[model samples]
Target: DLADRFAELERRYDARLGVYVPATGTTAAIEYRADERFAFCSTFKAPLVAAVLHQNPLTHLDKLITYTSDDIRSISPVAQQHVQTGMTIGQLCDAAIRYSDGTAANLLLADLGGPGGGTAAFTGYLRSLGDTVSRLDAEAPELNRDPPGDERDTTTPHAIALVLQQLVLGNALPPDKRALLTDWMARNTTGAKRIRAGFPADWKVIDKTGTGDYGRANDIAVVWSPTGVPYVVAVMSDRAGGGYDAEPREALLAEAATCVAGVLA
Candidate 1:
């Protein structure tokens, strides 16, 4: 029944979707073209945060970083809100995760020793989690320069689900740091119209939302039912060769997520 529902949803959207629910075991609870990789968009921020925290001391997170007009790039509403301000590394991380701020993401990458160091650390961290397939080779500005289909950074739904599982259960960071990261994701505001819209009032979703040019929308989340069982889910879609139609696509993602919730319920 769940498989049929998943197929019907994919048909309705005329797009491919990927979903991984680890709590349901090794086999995906629902999957449709999930093995294919797509440009990760802002979904990459979650791992970036984990890698940055894993390699640095908690005190390092408090160090202040300044943002000038030069740092301003595309798709960073949060950074645009406070130009020429000195924000702590912790605060920049918050902006990156909660608001998907590209400027804050680039700043964090710089703090981690620029693109080379940040990408190395990020890739190594994923390898430590047994995910060597995913890659983050481009900087934030480069990623934003092109539409989602053209972006160099890419990941599969399965890889993203594994990353989230490791973030939730792995010992890469101290308990406090892990809790802090989870809290930031829980408060994410950008994805309200995506996966968050599918759930009931009592359910809790800790997630990150990513939007790119050419109708790319993605949400990767650790969702909790009212019973408190947590499961990782990633929904990625792109309107290939078409204008952006975010609302209908996002609604479809929500419906798919709700179907997973129903299976869990």
Candidate 2:
């Protein structure tokens, strides 16, 4: 019955869905599309922050970086609120991860040595962690405009799931740094209507969301059941029409998450 229900849930949408429960330790516990690639969008910030934290000392996170009007080329109401002033690397990471701030992402990219070096660092970090399906070929604003079909700055649902798995299992950063990253994601205000909408009141989800042109809506996370076991879930969708009405897509994501929760329960 659960098998049929899971298949039916997937058949309801024309999107890529990936769910991996390491706690189950069996193929039946995971359902995914092997080759589907989706635009990483702001979701890339999670790994970007991971790479940044990995390559720099913990103290480096507190260094102040100044931003001027010239650096204000993208979305970031929080950063814009403090325009002409400086924010620490920690603050920028918070804005990028929690608020999905495009300007903050670009600023971090520039800090990591521009698009080329940043891409290398991000992808390299992911590769070291055994993820081969994610890449960052362009900066945030440009990648946001590119279609999901484009391979640049893209990732498979599976790739993101593994990335989250690494982060959750503390395989990517030291305990302190991992806690910092996890806290930011746990406090994310975006994706309020996505996977978390389907979660039980006692459960918790630490996640990042991504949106792009063409109705691309994506959210990936580590969901902790009330029983204390955590699983990784990533859902990505793109509509034929290039509009931003993601409510329906978000609902589907929540439904898929609910199904996964049922399996875990």
> How many clashes does the backbone of model 1 have?
0
Candidate 1 lDDT (Cα, whole model)? 0.77
- Model 2 agreement with the true structure over 43-129: per-residue lDDT tens digits: 899888887888799999899988788877777867888676788999999999999988888888877774484777677778998
Candidate 2 pairs with clashing backbones? none
Global lDDT for candidate 2? Answer: 0.76
Error (Å) of candidate 2 at residue 150 is: 1.9
TM-score, predicted candidate 2 vs. hidden true structure? 0.88
TM-score of each: 0.89, 0.88
Model 1 C-alpha lDDT per residue in residues 154-244, reported as the tens digit of each score: 8888888888888975676789989989999999988887778877778888899876655667899887778776778888877654554
Question: Model 1 Cα displacement at 46 (Å)?
Answer: 0.8
Model 1 scores a TM of 0.89
